PDB file of C-alpha atoms in Angstrom:
ATOM      1  CA  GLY A   1      30.724 -15.283 -21.613  1.00 34.59           C
ATOM      2  CA  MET A   2      34.091 -15.192 -19.871  1.00 36.90           C
ATOM      3  CA  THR A   3      34.268 -11.395 -19.577  1.00 35.58           C
ATOM      4  CA  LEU A   4      30.912 -11.236 -17.762  1.00 37.57           C
ATOM      5  CA  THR A   5      30.863 -10.889 -14.008  1.00 36.91           C
ATOM      6  CA  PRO A   6      28.367 -13.563 -12.819  1.00 34.13           C
ATOM      7  CA  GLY A   7      25.791 -11.001 -11.680  1.00 32.30           C
ATOM      8  CA  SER A   8      26.231  -8.221 -14.255  1.00 32.14           C
ATOM      9  CA  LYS A   9      23.852  -7.193 -17.054  1.00 31.60           C
ATOM     10  CA  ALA A  10      25.530  -9.194 -19.880  1.00 26.40           C
ATOM     11  CA  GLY A  11      26.085  -6.506 -22.474  1.00 23.50           C
ATOM     12  CA  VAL A  12      26.227  -3.147 -20.690  1.00 23.73           C
ATOM     13  CA  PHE A  13      28.374  -1.694 -17.905  1.00 20.79           C
ATOM     14  CA  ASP A  14      26.444   0.694 -15.650  1.00 19.77           C
ATOM     15  CA  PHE A  15      28.257   2.653 -12.941  1.00 18.73           C
ATOM     16  CA  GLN A  16      25.187   2.526 -10.670  1.00 19.33           C
ATOM     17  CA  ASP A  17      25.255  -1.268 -10.319  1.00 19.21           C
ATOM     18  CA  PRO A  18      27.258  -2.520  -7.300  1.00 19.37           C
ATOM     19  CA  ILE A  19      28.309  -5.869  -8.801  1.00 18.75           C
ATOM     20  CA  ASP A  20      29.526  -4.167 -11.980  1.00 18.33           C
ATOM     21  CA  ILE A  21      31.882  -1.737 -10.232  1.00 13.02           C
ATOM     22  CA  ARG A  22      33.216  -4.427  -7.840  1.00 15.13           C
ATOM     23  CA  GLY A  23      31.573  -2.682  -4.894  1.00 17.06           C
ATOM     24  CA  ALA A  24      33.108   0.694  -5.730  1.00 15.44           C
ATOM     25  CA  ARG A  25      32.292   4.020  -4.088  1.00 15.12           C
ATOM     26  CA  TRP A  26      32.240   7.626  -5.324  1.00 13.72           C
ATOM     27  CA  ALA A  27      34.075   8.472  -8.545  1.00 10.41           C
ATOM     28  CA  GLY A  28      37.645   7.157  -8.527  1.00 13.17           C
ATOM     29  CA  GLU A  29      36.731   3.591  -7.597  1.00 15.70           C
ATOM     30  CA  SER A  30      33.925   3.266 -10.155  1.00 14.27           C
ATOM     31  CA  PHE A  31      35.960   4.702 -13.025  1.00 14.51           C
ATOM     32  CA  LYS A  32      38.904   2.475 -12.105  1.00 10.14           C
ATOM     33  CA  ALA A  33      36.460  -0.444 -12.166  1.00 11.29           C
ATOM     34  CA  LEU A  34      35.582   0.645 -15.700  1.00  9.43           C
ATOM     35  CA  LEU A  35      39.308   0.589 -16.489  1.00  9.10           C
ATOM     36  CA  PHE A  36      39.538  -2.974 -15.172  1.00  6.72           C
ATOM     37  CA  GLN A  37      36.493  -3.882 -17.274  1.00 11.02           C
ATOM     38  CA  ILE A  38      38.127  -2.591 -20.458  1.00 13.30           C
ATOM     39  CA  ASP A  39      41.288  -4.490 -19.489  1.00 14.55           C
ATOM     40  CA  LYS A  40      39.206  -7.666 -19.233  1.00 15.67           C
ATOM     41  CA  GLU A  41      37.653  -6.872 -22.614  1.00 14.54           C
ATOM     42  CA  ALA A  42      41.108  -6.514 -24.178  1.00 11.19           C
ATOM     43  CA  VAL A  43      42.192  -9.828 -22.648  1.00 12.77           C
ATOM     44  CA  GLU A  44      39.060 -11.482 -24.045  1.00 12.86           C
ATOM     45  CA  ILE A  45      39.915 -10.031 -27.460  1.00 17.76           C
ATOM     46  CA  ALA A  46      43.380 -11.565 -27.155  1.00 17.11           C
ATOM     47  CA  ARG A  47      41.831 -14.930 -26.300  1.00 17.63           C
ATOM     48  CA  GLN A  48      39.348 -14.729 -29.180  1.00 18.89           C
ATOM     49  CA  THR A  49      41.437 -13.487 -32.110  1.00 19.89           C
ATOM     50  CA  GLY A  50      44.643 -15.086 -30.863  1.00 18.16           C
TER      51      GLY A  50
ATOM     52  CA  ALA B   1       4.372  -7.149  16.427  1.00 17.92           C
ATOM     53  CA  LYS B   2       6.236  -7.532  19.725  1.00 21.47           C
ATOM     54  CA  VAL B   3       8.407  -5.149  21.718  1.00 20.69           C
ATOM     55  CA  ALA B   4      12.127  -5.715  22.174  1.00 21.83           C
ATOM     56  CA  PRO B   5      13.154  -6.745  25.713  1.00 20.97           C
ATOM     57  CA  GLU B   6      15.065  -4.042  27.553  1.00 15.68           C
ATOM     58  CA  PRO B   7      18.731  -5.022  28.200  1.00 15.16           C
ATOM     59  CA  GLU B   8      19.169  -2.882  31.338  1.00 15.57           C
ATOM     60  CA  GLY B   9      20.265   0.709  30.711  1.00 16.13           C
ATOM     61  CA  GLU B  10      23.556   2.110  29.386  1.00 17.74           C
ATOM     62  CA  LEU B  11      21.925   2.747  26.020  1.00 19.92           C
ATOM     63  CA  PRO B  12      24.211   4.373  23.423  1.00 23.37           C
ATOM     64  CA  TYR B  13      23.541   8.079  23.027  1.00 24.97           C
ATOM     65  CA  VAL B  14      21.252   9.271  20.234  1.00 28.01           C
ATOM     66  CA  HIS B  15      21.619  12.888  19.150  1.00 32.40           C
ATOM     67  CA  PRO B  16      18.224  14.573  18.637  1.00 31.37           C
ATOM     68  CA  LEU B  17      17.971  16.657  15.457  1.00 33.08           C
ATOM     69  CA  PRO B  18      14.848  18.867  15.544  1.00 32.18           C
ATOM     70  CA  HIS B  19      15.977  20.378  12.224  1.00 31.73           C
ATOM     71  CA  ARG B  20      14.194  17.616  10.275  1.00 29.39           C
ATOM     72  CA  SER B  21      12.646  15.621  13.161  1.00 26.53           C
ATOM     73  CA  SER B  22      15.639  13.291  12.738  1.00 27.46           C
ATOM     74  CA  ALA B  23      18.509  11.983  14.861  1.00 29.89           C
ATOM     75  CA  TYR B  24      22.018  10.568  14.476  1.00 31.79           C
ATOM     76  CA  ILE B  25      23.922   7.629  15.959  1.00 35.33           C
ATOM     77  CA  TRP B  26      27.224   6.045  14.915  1.00 35.20           C
ATOM     78  CA  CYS B  27      26.788   2.264  14.797  1.00 32.69           C
ATOM     79  CA  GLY B  28      29.647   0.981  12.643  1.00 33.55           C
ATOM     80  CA  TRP B  29      30.177  -1.954  10.290  1.00 34.93           C
ATOM     81  CA  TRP B  30      29.466  -4.803  12.723  1.00 31.57           C
ATOM     82  CA  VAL B  31      25.945  -3.661  13.636  1.00 30.02           C
ATOM     83  CA  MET B  32      24.963  -3.144   9.993  1.00 30.33           C
ATOM     84  CA  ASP B  33      26.477  -6.485   8.972  1.00 34.06           C
ATOM     85  CA  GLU B  34      24.604  -8.190  11.812  1.00 34.12           C
ATOM     86  CA  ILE B  35      21.302  -6.567  10.814  1.00 34.79           C
ATOM     87  CA  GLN B  36      21.841  -7.498   7.158  1.00 36.20           C
ATOM     88  CA  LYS B  37      22.584 -11.102   8.145  1.00 36.62           C
ATOM     89  CA  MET B  38      19.503 -11.210  10.389  1.00 36.71           C
ATOM     90  CA  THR B  39      17.279  -9.941   7.569  1.00 37.14           C
ATOM     91  CA  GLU B  40      18.441 -12.666   5.180  1.00 35.59           C
ATOM     92  CA  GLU B  41      17.284 -15.938   6.812  1.00 37.19           C
ATOM     93  CA  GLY B  42      13.754 -14.618   7.373  1.00 36.34           C
ATOM     94  CA  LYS B  43      14.471 -13.407  10.916  1.00 36.15           C
ATOM     95  CA  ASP B  44      13.827  -9.953  12.397  1.00 34.40           C
ATOM     96  CA  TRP B  45      16.291  -7.395  13.743  1.00 34.73           C
ATOM     97  CA  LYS B  46      14.018  -4.914  15.546  1.00 34.82           C
ATOM     98  CA  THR B  47      13.061  -7.279  18.386  1.00 31.93           C
ATOM     99  CA  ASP B  48      14.179 -10.860  17.687  1.00 34.10           C
ATOM    100  CA  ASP B  49      17.265 -12.403  19.319  1.00 36.83           C
ATOM    101  CA  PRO B  50      17.399 -10.306  22.522  1.00 36.82           C
ATOM    102  CA  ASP B  51      20.664 -12.015  23.569  1.00 40.01           C
ATOM    103  CA  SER B  52      22.748 -11.132  20.511  1.00 41.20           C
ATOM    104  CA  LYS B  53      26.318  -9.863  20.695  1.00 44.75           C
ATOM    105  CA  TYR B  54      25.192  -6.347  19.696  1.00 47.73           C
ATOM    106  CA  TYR B  55      21.458  -6.479  20.435  1.00 47.29           C
ATOM    107  CA  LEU B  56      21.783  -3.414  22.680  1.00 44.65           C
ATOM    108  CA  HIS B  57      22.728  -1.280  19.675  1.00 44.82           C
ATOM    109  CA  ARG B  58      19.874  -2.815  17.662  1.00 45.60           C
ATOM    110  CA  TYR B  59      17.428  -2.008  20.474  1.00 47.66           C
ATOM    111  CA  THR B  60      18.790   1.546  20.507  1.00 48.14           C
ATOM    112  CA  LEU B  61      18.246   1.724  16.742  1.00 46.62           C
ATOM    113  CA  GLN B  62      14.675   0.459  17.168  1.00 49.87           C
ATOM    114  CA  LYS B  63      13.964   3.087  19.829  1.00 49.18           C
ATOM    115  CA  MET B  64      15.536   5.779  17.637  1.00 44.74           C
ATOM    116  CA  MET B  65      13.395   4.763  14.655  1.00 44.81           C
ATOM    117  CA  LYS B  66      10.239   4.725  16.789  1.00 46.30           C
ATOM    118  CA  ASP B  67      10.912   8.131  18.359  1.00 46.75           C
ATOM    119  CA  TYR B  68      12.222   9.836  15.203  1.00 46.65           C
ATOM    120  CA  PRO B  69      10.523   9.205  11.834  1.00 49.79           C
ATOM    121  CA  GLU B  70      13.515  10.161   9.636  1.00 49.65           C
ATOM    122  CA  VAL B  71      16.542   8.817  11.542  1.00 51.33           C
ATOM    123  CA  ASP B  72      20.029   9.178  10.014  1.00 50.97           C
ATOM    124  CA  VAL B  73      22.222   6.230  11.043  1.00 49.37           C
ATOM    125  CA  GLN B  74      25.840   6.230   9.848  1.00 48.41           C
ATOM    126  CA  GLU B  75      27.791   2.998   9.385  1.00 50.85           C
ATOM    127  CA  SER B  76      31.586   2.661   9.225  1.00 49.31           C
ATOM    128  CA  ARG B  77      32.264   0.543   6.126  1.00 49.13           C
ATOM    129  CA  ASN B  78      31.109   3.456   3.970  1.00 47.20           C
ATOM    130  CA  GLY B  79      29.923   6.083   6.457  1.00 47.45           C
ATOM    131  CA  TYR B  80      26.622   6.368   4.598  1.00 49.17           C
ATOM    132  CA  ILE B  81      23.625   7.825   6.426  1.00 50.58           C
ATOM    133  CA  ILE B  82      20.835   5.326   5.798  1.00 50.19           C
ATOM    134  CA  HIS B  83      17.399   6.717   6.603  1.00 50.76           C
ATOM    135  CA  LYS B  84      14.560   5.031   8.493  1.00 52.76           C
ATOM    136  CA  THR B  85      12.870   3.767   5.321  1.00 51.59           C
ATOM    137  CA  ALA B  86      16.166   2.361   4.019  1.00 49.73           C
ATOM    138  CA  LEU B  87      16.877   0.735   7.400  1.00 47.28           C
ATOM    139  CA  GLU B  88      13.380  -0.780   7.650  1.00 47.18           C
ATOM    140  CA  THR B  89      14.122  -3.582   5.179  1.00 44.07           C
ATOM    141  CA  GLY B  90      17.420  -4.476   6.866  1.00 41.92           C
ATOM    142  CA  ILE B  91      19.363  -4.611   3.578  1.00 39.65           C
ATOM    143  CA  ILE B  92      21.709  -1.638   3.429  1.00 41.61           C
ATOM    144  CA  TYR B  93      23.528  -1.572   0.095  1.00 45.47           C
ATOM    145  CA  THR B  94      24.796  -4.916  -1.236  1.00 43.61           C
ATOM    146  CA  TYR B  95      25.967  -8.444  -0.323  1.00 44.99           C
ATOM    147  CA  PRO B  96      23.923 -11.571   0.619  1.00 43.28           C
TER     148      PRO B  96
END
């Protein structure tokens, strides 16, 4: 839904997928992209539960 | 199926690497972006558009790929060394 990046896999977050890691490179960028993804998940939780 | 027209001389240097029958040239981000854009509308980058802004570098890349079967070309956006097979399609990593 809202958390999904338009071109992602819709349910999983794979570090090997360029659209999922916001065009990251090596290790720091991809893991920070994961951090941003979990931030988006928390925000979606806040929207859902209220 | 055609050969690229020769734009005079002054070709950028290609470093021969007999270690793996390879070579190395530093193109940058503009050449790779141009090649990726060319191989997105159905065009060709090896020989088409012989009057491009950076066609000389593309002709040098074509000559390098013909002479060396496992070329190692390094861009500048990520400095990745894309091989001849990866450069054949014209799509490097991402983006439309």
